[PDB]
């Protein structure tokens, strides 16, 4: 049972080295993508009632605003180019909950490409600092869209890597347990021999 013990420990070591390598890389990619995803979604929480409540009630919508706004409602399920659909949709208090709720793996590739060509259309119009000047409420929600989509497609890359990681991780811990059961036996003998 002793030789068995390290005959596992080495495999468990190497496995963990492998896990750390791919996990270090996955985490480097996350650092590359995600702090920005978070910053935006904190700025989300930051944004006031006034700044948005005032503009929701406005007669006309500006162009930078209608431009960066309309697609987000294609992202949020009542895909509607209509202004009053944005009125009604965004009039809900539950939206103050929805603001931070949307996730990245939910997005669909035709939505991603449609919004990427929509970027080509609004590439100038999509500049956060430029947009802020339209509204204090605005700017935070610019980088918000940019980050989400950039994770998308790139995230899929992270699919094989992360599923690989899940596999490795499940089995390393699976094996770790079947390593303890052994040292348990080995100590249980050392004391029953004594």
From Swiss-Prot:
Disulphides: none
Region (Stalk): 1-194
Domain of life, source organism: Eukaryota
Localization per record: Cytoplasm, Cytoskeleton, Cilium axoneme; Cell membrane; Cytoplasm
Disease affiliated with this protein: Short-rib thoracic dysplasia 3 with or without polydactyly: A form of short-rib thoracic dysplasia, a group of autosomal recessive ciliopathies that are characterized by a constricted thoracic cage, short ribs, shortened tubular bones, and a 'trident' appearance of the acetabular roof. Polydactyly is variably present. Non-skeletal involvement can include cleft lip/palate as well as anomalies of major organs such as the brain, eye, heart, kidneys, liver, pancreas, intestines, and genitalia.
Family note: Belongs to the dynein heavy chain family.
Job of this protein: May function as a motor for intraflagellar retrograde transport. Functions in cilia biogenesis. May play a role in transport between endoplasmic reticulum and Golgi or organization of the Golgi in cells.
Subunit structure: The cytoplasmic dynein complex 2 is probably composed by a heavy chain DYNC2H1 homodimer and a number of DYNC2LI1 light intermediate chains.
Protein name, per record: Cytoplasmic dynein 2 heavy chain 1
Organism: Homo sapiens (Human)
Full-protein positions shown: 2949 to 3142 of 4307
């Amino acid at each position: 049972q002793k030789t068995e013990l390290e005959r596992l420990k080495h495999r468990i070591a190497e496995e963990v080295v492998k896990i750390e390598e791919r996990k270090n890389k996955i985490d480097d990619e996350l650092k590359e993508v995600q702090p920005l995803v978070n910053e935006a979604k904190l700025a989300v929480g930051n944004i006031k009632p006034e700044s948005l409540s005032e503009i929701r009630s406005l007669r006309m919508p500006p162009d930078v605003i209608r431009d960066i706004l309309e697609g987000v409602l294609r992202l949020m399920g009542i895909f509607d180019t209509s202004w009053v659909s944005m009125k009604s949709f965004l009039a809900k208090r539950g939206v103050r909950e929805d603001i931070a709720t949307f996730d990245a793996r939910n997005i669909s590739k035709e939505i991603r490409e449609s919004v990427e060509e929509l970027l080509f259309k609004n590439k100038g119009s999509f500049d956060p600092k430029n947009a802020k000047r339209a509204s204090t409420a605005a700017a935070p929600l610019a980088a918000w869209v940019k980050a989400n989509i950039q994770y998308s497609h790139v995230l899929e890359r992270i699919h094989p890597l992360e599923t690989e990681q899940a596999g490795l991780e499940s089995n390393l811990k699976k094996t770790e347990d079947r390593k303890r059961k052994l040292e348990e036996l080995l100590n249980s003998v050392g004391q029953k021999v004594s």
